[PDB]
């Protein structure tokens, strides 16, 4: 008989870098609000 002492099997486990991983970022455009005095289209009429 032989003993597995020296030849024992190996388990594996990755060295995950999640602890130092950057996050996913969401973008939102800062709308030029119409609540603030934004301009409007100058629909014109004629006084005949």
């Amino acid at each position: 008989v032989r003993e597995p002492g020296s030849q024992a099997c190996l388990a594996i486990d990755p060295l995950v870098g999640e602890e130092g991983g950057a996050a996913v970022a969401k973008l939102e455009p800062h709308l030029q609000p119409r609540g603030q005095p934004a301009p409007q289209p100058l629909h014109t009429l004629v006084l005949a």
Partner: protein, 52 residues
């Protein structure tokens, strides 16, 4: 019995026996589990060890 089973597989492999166990063959088993089990159950030459 997972831990003792791993020790037993170590023992058998060291003694020269080609052992098939799910944890060590997880890839081919992952392809198709039932086919994998059948492959070893069909073969008469394969000897099956039951861990009680």
């Amino acid at each position: 019995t997972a831990m003792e089973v791993v020790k037993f597989v170590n023992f058998l492999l060291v003694n020269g026996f080609q052992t098939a166990i799910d944890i060590f063959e997880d890839r081919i088993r992952g392809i198709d589990i039932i086919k994998w089990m059948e492959r070893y159950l069909r073969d008469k030459t394969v000897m099956i060890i039951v861990a009680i």
